[PDB]
Amino acid sequence: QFYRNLGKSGLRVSCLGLGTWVTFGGQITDEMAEHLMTLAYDNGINLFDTAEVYAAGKAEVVLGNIIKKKGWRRSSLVITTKIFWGGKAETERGLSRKHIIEGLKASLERLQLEYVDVVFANRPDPNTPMEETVRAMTHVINQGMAMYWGTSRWSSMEIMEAYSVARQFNLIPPICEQAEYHMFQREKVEVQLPELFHKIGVGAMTWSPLACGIVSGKYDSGIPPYSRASLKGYQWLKDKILSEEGRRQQAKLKELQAIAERLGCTLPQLAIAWCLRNEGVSSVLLGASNAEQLMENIGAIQVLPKLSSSIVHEIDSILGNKPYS
Amino acid sequence: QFYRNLGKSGLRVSCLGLGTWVTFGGQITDEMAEHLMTLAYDNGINLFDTAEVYAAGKAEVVLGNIIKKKGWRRSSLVITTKIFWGGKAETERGLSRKHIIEGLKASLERLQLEYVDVVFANRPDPNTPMEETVRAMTHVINQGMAMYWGTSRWSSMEIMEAYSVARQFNLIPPICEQAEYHMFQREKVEVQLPELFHKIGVGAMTWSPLACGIVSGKYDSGIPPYSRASLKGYQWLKDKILSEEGRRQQAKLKELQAIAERLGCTLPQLAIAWCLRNEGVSSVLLGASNAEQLMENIGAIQVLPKLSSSIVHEIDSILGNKPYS
Amino acid sequence: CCERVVINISGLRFETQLKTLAQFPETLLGDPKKRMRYFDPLRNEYFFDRNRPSFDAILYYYQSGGRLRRPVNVPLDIFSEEIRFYELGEEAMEMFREDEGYIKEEERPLPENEFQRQVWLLF
Amino acid sequence: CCERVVINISGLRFETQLKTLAQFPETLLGDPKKRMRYFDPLRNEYFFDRNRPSFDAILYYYQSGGRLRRPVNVPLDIFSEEIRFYELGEEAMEMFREDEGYIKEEERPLPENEFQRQVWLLF
Ligand SMILES: NC(=O)c1ccc[n+]([C@@H]2O[C@H](COP(=O)([O-])OP(=O)(O)OC[C@H]3O[C@@H](n4cnc5c(N)ncnc54)[C@H](OP(=O)(O)O)[C@@H]3O)[C@@H](O)[C@H]2O)c1
Ligand SMILES: NC(=O)c1ccc[n+]([C@@H]2O[C@H](COP(=O)([O-])OP(=O)(O)OC[C@H]3O[C@@H](n4cnc5c(N)ncnc54)[C@H](OP(=O)(O)O)[C@@H]3O)[C@@H](O)[C@H]2O)c1
């Protein structure tokens, strides 16, 4: 089933989503950005995630001009946005009522949209009450600026606190959760998020399935040119690959080359179908810089029937990081 | 009295309504569609039911151009619509918050209306919580896109579940219910619906009183040309008439020819006044393809004083399908 | 089953599943036609302006499945007029009085002669 | 820690702190996997369609830290079937019966000869 619900909610999203982090409005051109979304929308992807912090707001502008140019129905797309960083002023950060209403109204003029499907609190705000956040998220849903709302990187106590305020004050609880989930980051989505799904009905929309390109295996011979680790201002990713904990991970990926060779797949297709192997993960936000990468990653749906129970047991012996409840 | 309340609600509808299914935007022309509504509105009918799934949205366009051309006051009409199927995309079906809000707004631009009166959930949605449906139906009422809302083809447990969410969260409960009710479909409106009416105050707006034209008796000599069973894509109605359960029903309709001869009426006028014989049914949605059929069916109000208790006992011995509580 | 039924006894609210009350279909809380006249539609509850401490023993009759007993603070005249309202039957009333000890099954049958009967009562 | 937990016992609300119930991790109210099936998400509460006066003694078991005692109006057959549901253990059940005085630790060990055992029970 390619299309699956987002939590318990009625919102049907595809199992692969497209992200605009780094690539759109930054790394790749506007013409390649138009070509990647046409390749994604013709393969059944309806989930297109952006944020206001990406490229200082230029990533929403590129996404906004493609929907107007292609003439796509707004009904067939699921556009999601994230709000937390609006700019340099002190009132332009956080999850206050001032910034949720202003920052979403500012994003709807760059996206050129009447409304967005899911608005995401991009990170938690310790300097704001949870009543003020849940009332401001309910406000932009009742005004019609958003349909749903979710949280990004919020611990499961913060999600359960935001749920108990919405039942107290007759507000709207969040439907979703974006959490990092790849082969080297498993603690939240396998232990903390499954408990929240069966209790209150919050699903996970996991991002970075290839760990910013590490699990694709391209960094085994050092840093290739024109990849994300060589871009300006991404020294934190080069320090992550070349460090001794990051050199050990590449020694595991060569052991995963043999498992990806036993199947027909590649290592990016293996690393995505491994993220979709459970019913808790409701979607996976891809990242793609050209048309060969996106065509490769949409081929990971075919690898999902190929994963048996035994290959899941075989990969977890290579990874050696399975969390305990 | 010809005008009667819709449930316990204050909405006064006529006892006969006109439906746009098949005939409008499909079978008959735009000029005949203009003539049928002028014949209906001059006989006191104010209830005009349409949907977004009818004729791929073209049935609301025909209805929309007649109200603008005739210059009818919007205050004197009761326009109802149904929202379940919007199109081919996965996000364009169901009773999610995205499709109710999105779908209704699309129907109000084809109808060229500022609001409809009753928006109907055209069928239940198992992949959506009832909280999300009742919050989205409450949302389009508080925005002013609809006045009331109802449900179509919902099990009386699903109606009672939607009622208990509206009292829990201080939302708006549904006022109505569309259920199929003719001489050959009696189980829901005579057993399940009456219980709901006295408990929570939900009325029935029954559709297809002639069972898509079967109970009119025209199909006794086979399939006549230019009737609904001979239209394109309606093989399910030809398979229903010509089957051995459907050939048995025509043997009952010849026995109803004698009862319709004892009164002054015909068999379509008998089959409609039989549907209005109880206080639970709040309206009947007609279907008419020309001006002789609609003038005939509005003559079924005169037959409603002619039905005594004894003729109701006589028809039910011919039908042989009275439900047991 | 899953459905929950709120019963309000003079401002005291008891919530129970519908498949608990439907275990006993001939009582006032088991028959939907009987309890229809007590439904408050604006609050989605059944309102009974009746005795308050009697109903916890009436509620636990349905939950335990037929084990009712009188509460310690509710007298026998008050609580027996509650079993007759909630219509728990002529059968669960006799099991109530035997636990209570109010067991008086004395029925003097006459000799049936109509004077053999009549002179019998004289002696 | 500060997270308050609402437990609904047949319409009777019992709000408690989460660090009170988590003091005893092997009971039904202490283990989150066990009490997961009783959660009402539309009301944000745990609904138990159980006995009502029994739970105030079950709630004060967690608050006092292990001091449970039977309420005066709840019989011994009703209240002992509540300790088995709420899963307060084989250990806090034995402390309950000794307070109660229902202490029957009689276990006749046989002589183990299998006829020395068998003839022993004859005498
Ligand atoms: N806090 C949040 O909510 C949050 C944070 C970050 C991201 N996100 C979302 O998730 C998305 C990003 O995921 P991600 O981009 O960070 O990790 P991926 O794992 O999504 O990263 C993909 C990037 O790695 C490389 N790559 C992908 N597939 C490849 C293949 N088959 N072969 C070789 N290389 C491949 C690509 O080229 P290069 O190696 O040349 O770059 C591509 O730019 C964003 O679009 C964003 O919307 C959300
Ligand atoms: N799920 C739902 O909520 C739902 C579903 C279906 C319909 N509806 C509503 O109910 C309405 C339709 O009812 P219906 O049309 O399906 O059954 P009817 O029983 O309402 O069908 C009438 C159709 O049968 C024939 N007919 C009617 N009167 C006649 C007469 N006196 N003599 C000869 N033929 C006669 C007509 O010509 P032909 O035989 O040539 O066609 C007409 O098109 C729609 O307008 C719709 O709004 C609701």
Residue numbers in the entry:
A (entry chain A), B (entry chain C): 37 to 361
C (entry chain D), D (entry chain B): 31 to 153
Q: What text comes from the article?
A:
Voltage-activated potassium (Kv) channels open in response to membrane depolarization to conduct K+ ions, a process that is critical for electrical signaling in neurons and endocrine cells, as well as muscle contraction. Kv channels contain voltage-sensing domains that activate with membrane depolarization, and a central pore domain that opens to conduct K+ ions with high selectivity. The X-ray crystal structure of Kv1.2, a mammalian homolog of the Shaker Kv channel, and those of the Kv1.2–2.1 chimera containing the S3b-S4 paddle motif from Kv2.1 (Kv chimera), serve as a structural framework for understanding the gating mechanism of Kv channels. Since no structure has been obtained for a voltage-activated ion channel in a membrane environment, in the present study we solved the structure of the Kv chimera reconstituted in a lipid nanodisc environment using single-particle cryo-electron microscopy (cryo-EM).
We initially generated a map of the entire complex (α4β4) and obtained an average resolution of the entire map of 3.3 Å. However, the map exhibited a lower local resolution in the transmembrane domain (resolutions of ~4–7.5 Å), likely stemming from the alignment of particles against the cytosolic domain during 3D classification and 3D refinement, and the variability in relative arrangements of the cytosolic and transmembrane domains. We built three models for the Kv chimera: one for the cytosolic domain, another for the transmembrane domain, and a third hybrid model that combines the two models which fits in the overall 3.3 Å resolution map of the entire complex. Comparison of the cryo-EM structure in nanodiscs and the X-ray crystal structure in detergent shows that they are similar. We do see a slight shift/rotation of the cytosolic region of the α subunit and β subunit with respect to the transmembrane domain of the α subunit when compared to the crystal structure, with the most pronounced changes in the β subunit, likely reflecting the lack of contacts between molecules that are present in the crystal of the Kv chimera. Although the highest resolution X-ray structure of the Kv chimera is at 2.4 Å resolution, and our cryo-EM structure is at a resolution of ~3 Å in the cytosolic domain and ~4 Å in the transmembrane domain, our structure in a membrane environment implies that the protein adopts an essentially native structure in detergent in the presence of lipids. We detected only subtle structural changes in the external pore in the selectivity filter of the Kv chimera, as well as a small rotation of the cytosolic region of the α subunit and the β subunit, a region involved in crystal packing in the X-ray structure. Our cryo-EM structure of the Kv chimera in nanodiscs suggests that the structural changes during C-type inactivation are likely not large, and would be compatible with very small movements on the scale <2 Å.
